[PDB]
């Protein structure tokens, strides 16, 4: 009665109009996604060649899960599958306004419902001509690697043998005690110990009469952004846009992770052979196989490896 009623899209729709609106908006979403499938025939920005010191954009993938993988030396590596789901370049800014001294590309992925987004976000995506994305991450790039907003990005943007950095929100474990959060030893279970088994001991010294900032104390654990560095790209399924990344990735299954070329010094100039701006399937220079493998990977369907 005060006028601040919170409305949702379905509230005033009839039984007939609800499925109609659902189907209409889904059709518009898929049409918009398909309209961006040929970036090279849509006035692409200049495609410069790779130079040393160039940083290209990354992707936003979805953590599918983990599976084993075997190398020709006979070792087992656990690998994590990251699916690139409707990842598009959304925004571009120059060095001056990038909050630093390097051009920036905002990239989104994992299309979400337009009915659940703020009006400003909906307007932004309407101007862009794309359905809204769940997460938008900013990638620092050199001007050589600028890509026109709206261009799709694919798993084949990376290649096997490359090293990658994956950043994501870790699994949230809620308010955790200090034993689980910081691996404190706690106190013994018996021998007179009463009502203190998992408690922090002293938290400071008596002299300072206070507790230092940054003291390890019980509190919220996880649900913060962490980066795993230097993970090898073992394989790329181009059909389903899957990247097989060595080892573990922060966060839970079906969570969006930001994937970018590794920043480690050892992998500083490994971008020579990588698609420099990005991979363009519309380029059609050579239709990539369904699966791109690293050299050492024991591919399934290969004859059983014999260490001869």
Partner RNA sequence: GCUACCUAAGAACAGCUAAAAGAGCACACCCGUCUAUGUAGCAAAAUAGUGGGAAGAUUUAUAGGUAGAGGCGACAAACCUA
Partner RNA sequence: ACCUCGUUGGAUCAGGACAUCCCGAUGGUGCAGCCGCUAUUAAAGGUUCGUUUGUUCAACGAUUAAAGUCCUACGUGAUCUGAGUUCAGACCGGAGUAAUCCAGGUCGGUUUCUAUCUACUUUAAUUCCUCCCUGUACGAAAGGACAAGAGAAAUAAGGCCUACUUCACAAAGCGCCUUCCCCCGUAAAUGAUAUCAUCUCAACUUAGUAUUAUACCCACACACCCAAGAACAGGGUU
Site for another protein in 271-300 (CB under 8 A): 298, 300
CB-wise, 216 or 239, nearer to RNA? 216
CB count in 10 Å sphere of residue 198:
13
**Which of 173/216 has CB closer to another protein?**
173
Enumerate residues 260-289 that contact RNA by CB under 7 A.
260, 263-266
- The Cα 215–Cα 247 span in angstroms is 31
Among 126, 220, 268, 272, binds RNA (CB under 7 A): 220
Tokens encoding 169: 């929100």
CB 235 within 8 A of CB 69: yes
Which three-class secondary structure state does DSSP give residue 188? coil
Nearer to another protein, 114 or 240 (CB): 240
**Segment interacting with another protein, rule: CB under 8 A, options 17-25, 144-152, 208-216, 281-289:** 17-25
Structural contact between residues 166 and 227, judged by C-beta atoms closer than 8 angstroms: yes
Q: Can residue 31 be called a binding residue for RNA (CB under 7 A)?
A: no
- Only segment of 94-102, 161-169, 235-243, 263-271 that touches another protein (CB under 8 A): 235-243
List the alpha helices (DSSP H) in 77-197: 119-128, 178-182
Q: Is 236 one of the binding residues for another protein (CB under 8 A)?
A: no
| Contact of residue 50 among another protein, RNA, none (CB under 5-8 Å per partner type) | none
Q: Minimum distance from CB of 178 to RNA (Å)? A: 7
Q: Is there binding between residue 302 and another protein (CB under 8 A)?
A: yes
Closest among 7, 71, 79 to 237, alpha carbons compared: 79
Look at residues 10, 173, 36, 148 and name the one whose alpha carbon lies nearest to residue 90.
148
């Amino acid at each position: 009665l005060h006028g601040k009623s919170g409305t949702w899209w379905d509230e005033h729709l009839s039984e007939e109009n609800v499925p109609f609106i659902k189907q209409l908006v889904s059709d518009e979403d898929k049409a918009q996604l398909a309209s961006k499938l040929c970036p090279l025939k849509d006035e692409p920005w200049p495609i410069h060649p790779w130079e040393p010191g160039s940083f290209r954009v990354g992707l936003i993938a979805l953590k599918l899960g983990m599976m084993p993988l075997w190398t020709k030396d006979g070792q087992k590596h656990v690998v994590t599958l990251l699916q690139v789901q409707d990842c598009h370049v959304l925004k571009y800014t120059s060095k001056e306004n990038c909050n630093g001294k390097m051009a920036t590309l905002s990239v989104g992925g994992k299309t979400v419902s337009r009915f659940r987004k703020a009006t400003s976000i909906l307007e932004f995506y309407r101007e862009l001509g794309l359905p809204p994305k769940q997460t938008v991450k900013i990638f620092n790039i050199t001007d050589n690697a600028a890509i026109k907003p709206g261009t799709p990005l694919y798993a084949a943007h990376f290649r096997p043998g490359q090293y990658v950095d994956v950043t994501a929100k870790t699994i949230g474990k809620g308010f955790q005690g200090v034993m689980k959060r910081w691996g404190f030893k706690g106190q013994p279970a018996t021998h007179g110990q009463t009502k203190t088994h998992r408690r922090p001991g002293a938290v400071a010294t008596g002299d300072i009469g206070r507790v230092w900032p940054g003291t390890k104390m019980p509190g919220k654990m996880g649900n913060i952004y962490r980066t795993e560095y230097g993970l090898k790209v073992w394989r790329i399924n181009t059909k389903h846009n899957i990247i097989y990344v060595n080892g573990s990735v922060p966060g839970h299954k079906n969570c969006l992770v930001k994937v970018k070329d590794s920043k480690l010094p050892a992998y500083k100039d490994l971008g020579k052979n990588l698609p420099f701006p990005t991979y363009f399937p519309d380029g059609d220079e050579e239709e990539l196989p369904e699966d791109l493998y690293d050299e050492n990977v024991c591919q399934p369907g290969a004859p059983s490896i014999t260490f001869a």
